[PDB]
Curated annotation (Swiss-Prot):
Keywords: Endosome, Glycoprotein, Hydrolase, Lysosome, Membrane, Protease, Signal, Transmembrane, Transmembrane helix. It is an enzyme of class 3 (hydrolase). It comes from Homo sapiens. The keyword Transmembrane applies. Glycosylated. This is Signal peptide peptidase-like 2A. The chain crosses the membrane at residues 5-25, 36-56, 63-83, 88-108, 114-134, 143-163, 182-200, 218-238, 241-261. Ubiquitous. It is linked to Immunodeficiency 86: An autosomal recessive disorder characterized by susceptibility to mycobacterial disease after exposure to BCG vaccine. Affected individuals usually develop localized mycobacterial lymphadenopathy. Its EC number is 3.4.23.-. The active site is at residues 153, 192.
Length: 274
Protein backbone atom coordinates (compact mmCIF):
# COMPACT_ATOMS: atom_id res chain seq x y z
CA UNK A 1 0.00 0.00 0.00
CA UNK A 2 1.12 3.56 -0.72
CA UNK A 3 0.79 4.73 2.89
CA UNK A 4 3.89 3.12 4.37
CA UNK A 5 5.70 5.37 1.89
CA UNK A 6 3.58 8.43 2.76
CA UNK A 7 3.56 8.04 6.55
CA UNK A 8 7.29 7.39 6.25
CA UNK A 9 7.69 10.79 4.57
CA UNK A 10 5.32 12.64 6.92
CA UNK A 11 7.06 11.19 9.99
CA UNK A 12 10.62 11.82 8.74
CA UNK A 13 10.48 15.35 7.36
CA UNK A 14 8.57 16.40 10.48
CA UNK A 15 11.39 15.03 12.66
CA UNK A 16 14.16 16.29 10.37
CA UNK A 17 12.62 19.76 10.07
CA UNK A 18 12.00 19.90 13.81
CA UNK A 19 15.60 18.99 14.57
CA UNK A 20 16.93 21.45 12.00
CA UNK A 21 14.57 24.19 13.19
CA UNK A 22 15.64 23.61 16.80
CA UNK A 23 19.29 23.86 15.79
CA UNK A 24 18.54 27.08 13.90
CA UNK A 25 17.20 28.68 17.09
CA UNK A 26 20.29 27.62 19.04
CA UNK A 27 22.58 29.21 16.44
CA UNK A 28 21.13 32.65 17.24
CA UNK A 29 21.64 32.32 21.01
CA UNK A 30 25.34 31.62 20.48
CA UNK A 31 25.50 34.43 17.91
CA UNK A 32 23.53 37.24 19.57
CA UNK A 33 24.67 36.22 23.07
CA UNK A 34 16.53 15.53 34.82
CA UNK A 35 17.37 12.38 36.79
CA UNK A 36 15.22 12.95 39.88
CA UNK A 37 11.97 14.24 38.32
CA UNK A 38 11.49 10.95 36.44
CA UNK A 39 9.49 9.57 39.38
CA UNK A 40 7.11 12.54 39.32
CA UNK A 41 6.81 12.26 35.54
CA UNK A 42 5.95 8.56 35.88
CA UNK A 43 3.40 9.18 38.61
CA UNK A 44 1.60 12.14 37.11
CA UNK A 45 1.70 10.62 33.64
CA UNK A 46 0.20 7.27 34.51
CA UNK A 47 -2.36 9.11 36.66
CA UNK A 48 -3.55 10.85 33.49
CA UNK A 49 -3.96 7.51 31.72
CA UNK A 50 -5.85 6.11 34.73
CA UNK A 51 -8.18 9.13 34.68
CA UNK A 52 -8.72 8.71 30.93
CA UNK A 53 -9.59 5.05 31.46
CA UNK A 54 -12.01 5.81 34.30
CA UNK A 55 -13.61 9.06 33.03
CA UNK A 56 -13.34 8.64 29.25
CA UNK A 57 -16.67 10.31 28.43
CA UNK A 58 -16.14 13.76 29.96
CA UNK A 59 -12.33 13.67 29.69
CA UNK A 60 -12.05 13.05 25.94
CA UNK A 61 -13.63 16.43 25.13
CA UNK A 62 -11.15 18.33 27.30
CA UNK A 63 -8.33 16.50 25.52
CA UNK A 64 -9.86 17.43 22.16
CA UNK A 65 -10.12 21.09 23.20
CA UNK A 66 -6.54 21.10 24.50
CA UNK A 67 -5.37 19.59 21.22
CA UNK A 68 -7.30 22.22 19.25
CA UNK A 69 -5.84 25.14 21.20
CA UNK A 70 -2.29 23.76 21.29
CA UNK A 71 -2.33 22.85 17.59
CA UNK A 72 -3.69 26.27 16.63
CA UNK A 73 -0.95 27.99 18.64
CA UNK A 74 1.73 25.69 17.21
CA UNK A 75 0.47 26.16 13.65
CA UNK A 76 0.53 29.93 14.10
CA UNK A 77 4.09 29.75 15.46
CA UNK A 78 5.23 27.47 12.62
CA UNK A 79 3.64 29.47 9.80
CA UNK A 80 4.89 32.74 11.31
CA UNK A 81 8.54 31.91 10.57
CA UNK A 82 8.05 31.20 6.86
CA UNK A 83 6.39 34.57 6.30
CA UNK A 84 8.93 36.32 8.56
CA UNK A 85 11.57 35.13 6.10
CA UNK A 86 9.46 36.57 3.25
CA UNK A 87 9.83 40.39 2.91
CA UNK A 88 0.32 43.60 11.97
CA UNK A 89 -2.56 42.99 9.56
CA UNK A 90 -0.80 39.97 8.06
CA UNK A 91 -0.14 38.49 11.51
CA UNK A 92 -3.77 38.84 12.60
CA UNK A 93 -4.86 37.36 9.26
CA UNK A 94 -2.61 34.36 9.91
CA UNK A 95 -3.98 34.05 13.46
CA UNK A 96 -7.53 34.11 12.11
CA UNK A 97 -6.67 31.48 9.51
CA UNK A 98 -5.13 29.22 12.16
CA UNK A 99 -8.03 29.53 14.60
CA UNK A 100 -10.48 28.99 11.73
CA UNK A 101 -8.68 25.80 10.70
CA UNK A 102 -8.65 24.57 14.30
CA UNK A 103 -12.36 25.28 14.81
CA UNK A 104 -13.26 23.71 11.46
CA UNK A 105 -11.36 20.57 12.45
CA UNK A 106 -13.06 20.54 15.86
CA UNK A 107 -16.51 20.80 14.28
CA UNK A 108 -15.72 18.22 11.58
CA UNK A 109 -14.09 15.51 13.69
CA UNK A 110 -16.09 12.42 12.71
CA UNK A 111 -16.29 13.22 8.98
CA UNK A 112 -13.64 10.63 8.11
CA UNK A 113 -13.54 11.63 4.43
CA UNK A 114 -11.54 14.86 4.74
CA UNK A 115 -10.94 15.47 8.46
CA UNK A 116 -7.79 13.32 8.35
CA UNK A 117 -5.86 15.93 6.36
CA UNK A 118 -6.75 18.66 8.86
CA UNK A 119 -5.74 16.41 11.74
CA UNK A 120 -2.46 15.59 10.00
CA UNK A 121 -1.65 19.27 9.37
CA UNK A 122 -2.48 20.24 12.96
CA UNK A 123 -0.51 17.30 14.34
CA UNK A 124 2.51 18.03 12.16
CA UNK A 125 2.48 21.62 13.42
CA UNK A 126 2.09 20.44 17.02
CA UNK A 127 4.98 17.98 16.72
CA UNK A 128 7.16 20.50 14.88
CA UNK A 129 6.64 22.93 17.76
CA UNK A 130 7.14 20.39 20.56
CA UNK A 131 10.37 19.16 18.96
CA UNK A 132 11.74 22.73 18.94
CA UNK A 133 10.52 24.29 22.20
CA UNK A 134 11.20 21.38 24.57
CA UNK A 135 14.91 21.59 25.44
CA UNK A 136 16.42 18.39 26.80
CA UNK A 137 19.54 19.55 28.67
CA UNK A 138 21.84 16.55 28.25
CA UNK A 139 22.03 13.11 26.68
CA UNK A 140 21.52 11.56 30.12
CA UNK A 141 18.00 13.00 30.14
CA UNK A 142 17.52 11.86 26.54
CA UNK A 143 18.48 8.29 27.45
CA UNK A 144 16.32 8.32 30.59
CA UNK A 145 13.23 9.66 28.82
CA UNK A 146 13.58 7.39 25.78
CA UNK A 147 14.14 4.31 27.92
CA UNK A 148 11.19 5.18 30.16
CA UNK A 149 8.86 5.62 27.19
CA UNK A 150 10.20 2.44 25.60
CA UNK A 151 9.28 0.67 28.84
CA UNK A 152 5.86 2.32 28.62
CA UNK A 153 5.42 0.94 25.11
CA UNK A 154 6.52 -2.49 26.29
CA UNK A 155 3.84 -2.25 28.98
CA UNK A 156 1.35 -1.20 26.30
CA UNK A 157 2.10 -4.31 24.24
CA UNK A 158 2.31 -6.60 27.29
CA UNK A 159 -0.86 -5.50 29.16
CA UNK A 160 -3.47 -5.08 26.41
CA UNK A 161 -3.70 -8.86 25.64
CA UNK A 162 -4.67 -9.46 29.28
CA UNK A 163 -7.73 -7.20 29.04
CA UNK A 164 -8.83 -8.66 25.70
CA UNK A 165 -17.08 6.65 24.19
CA UNK A 166 -17.63 7.02 20.44
CA UNK A 167 -15.07 9.84 20.15
CA UNK A 168 -11.47 9.41 19.02
CA UNK A 169 -8.35 10.74 20.70
CA UNK A 170 -6.51 13.28 18.52
CA UNK A 171 -3.13 12.06 19.79
CA UNK A 172 -2.67 10.02 16.60
CA UNK A 173 -1.95 10.78 12.95
CA UNK A 174 -4.51 9.20 10.63
CA UNK A 175 -3.96 8.28 6.98
CA UNK A 176 -6.40 6.21 4.87
CA UNK A 177 -5.24 3.54 2.44
CA UNK A 178 -3.84 5.59 -0.47
CA UNK A 179 -4.52 2.92 -3.09
CA UNK A 180 -7.96 4.00 -4.37
CA UNK A 181 -8.12 7.51 -2.83
CA UNK A 182 -14.84 2.39 3.70
CA UNK A 183 -11.27 3.58 4.18
CA UNK A 184 -9.05 1.63 6.61
CA UNK A 185 -6.44 3.41 8.73
CA UNK A 186 -2.67 3.81 9.01
CA UNK A 187 -2.15 5.22 12.50
CA UNK A 188 1.10 6.65 13.86
CA UNK A 189 0.96 8.40 17.21
CA UNK A 190 2.61 11.63 18.30
CA UNK A 191 4.91 9.84 20.74
CA UNK A 192 6.69 8.11 17.86
CA UNK A 193 7.53 11.46 16.22
CA UNK A 194 8.15 13.64 19.28
CA UNK A 195 10.10 11.38 21.64
CA UNK A 196 12.86 10.51 19.12
CA UNK A 197 12.32 13.95 17.59
CA UNK A 198 13.61 15.49 20.81
CA UNK A 199 16.72 13.29 20.65
CA UNK A 200 17.45 14.25 17.03
CA UNK A 201 16.88 17.90 17.94
CA UNK A 202 19.35 17.46 20.81
CA UNK A 203 21.87 15.88 18.44
CA UNK A 204 21.55 18.85 16.08
CA UNK A 205 21.78 21.29 19.00
CA UNK A 206 24.92 19.64 20.37
CA UNK A 207 26.44 19.61 16.88
CA UNK A 208 25.75 23.34 16.53
CA UNK A 209 27.23 23.99 19.98
CA UNK A 210 30.40 21.99 19.23
CA UNK A 211 31.93 23.52 16.11
CA UNK A 212 30.00 23.51 12.84
CA UNK A 213 29.09 20.20 11.19
CA UNK A 214 26.15 17.89 10.48
CA UNK A 215 27.39 14.54 11.82
CA UNK A 216 25.04 14.09 14.79
CA UNK A 217 21.93 15.45 13.07
CA UNK A 218 22.44 13.43 9.88
CA UNK A 219 23.31 10.26 11.80
CA UNK A 220 20.28 10.55 14.09
CA UNK A 221 17.90 11.27 11.20
CA UNK A 222 19.25 8.41 9.06
CA UNK A 223 18.99 6.00 11.99
CA UNK A 224 15.44 7.18 12.68
CA UNK A 225 14.51 6.55 9.04
CA UNK A 226 16.12 3.09 9.17
CA UNK A 227 14.22 2.32 12.37
CA UNK A 228 10.97 3.37 10.71
CA UNK A 229 11.79 1.11 7.75
CA UNK A 230 12.48 -1.77 10.16
CA UNK A 231 9.15 -1.11 11.91
CA UNK A 232 7.33 -1.27 8.58
CA UNK A 233 9.19 -4.43 7.55
CA UNK A 234 8.32 -6.15 10.84
CA UNK A 235 4.69 -5.06 10.50
CA UNK A 236 4.54 -6.47 6.96
CA UNK A 237 6.25 -9.77 7.82
CA UNK A 238 4.66 -10.52 11.20
CA UNK A 239 0.94 -9.74 10.87
CA UNK A 240 0.88 -7.90 14.19
CA UNK A 241 0.78 -4.30 15.35
CA UNK A 242 4.25 -3.65 16.75
CA UNK A 243 4.91 -0.37 18.60
CA UNK A 244 7.25 1.90 16.69
CA UNK A 245 9.26 3.02 19.71
CA UNK A 246 10.60 -0.50 20.22
CA UNK A 247 12.46 -0.11 16.91
CA UNK A 248 13.02 3.67 16.93
CA UNK A 249 14.61 4.08 20.38
CA UNK A 250 17.45 1.51 20.05
CA UNK A 251 18.31 2.53 16.48
CA UNK A 252 18.78 6.19 17.46
CA UNK A 253 20.30 5.77 20.93
CA UNK A 254 22.83 3.17 19.77
CA UNK A 255 23.96 5.23 16.77
CA UNK A 256 24.30 8.37 18.91
CA UNK A 257 26.39 6.40 21.41
CA UNK A 258 28.59 4.98 18.64
CA UNK A 259 29.10 8.41 17.06
CA UNK A 260 30.00 9.89 20.46
CA UNK A 261 32.41 7.05 21.28
CA UNK A 262 34.16 7.14 17.89
CA UNK A 263 34.70 10.91 18.12
CA UNK A 264 36.10 11.42 21.67
CA UNK A 265 32.95 13.44 22.42
CA UNK A 266 31.03 11.28 24.85
CA UNK A 267 31.84 13.01 28.13
CA UNK A 268 30.53 16.35 26.87
CA UNK A 269 27.62 14.65 25.10
CA UNK A 270 26.51 12.87 28.29
CA UNK A 271 27.10 15.78 30.69
CA UNK A 272 26.12 18.55 28.30
CA UNK A 273 28.17 21.48 27.05
CA UNK A 274 27.30 23.38 30.25
Amino acid sequence: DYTMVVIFVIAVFTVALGGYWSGLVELENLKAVSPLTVVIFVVICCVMMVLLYFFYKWLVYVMIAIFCIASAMSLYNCLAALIHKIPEVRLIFLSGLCIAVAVVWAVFRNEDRWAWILQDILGIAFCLNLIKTLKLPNFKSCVILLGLLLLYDVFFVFITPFITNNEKLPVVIRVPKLIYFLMPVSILGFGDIIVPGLLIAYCRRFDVQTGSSYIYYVSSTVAYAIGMILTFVVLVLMKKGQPALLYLVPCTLITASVVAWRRKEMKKFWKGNS
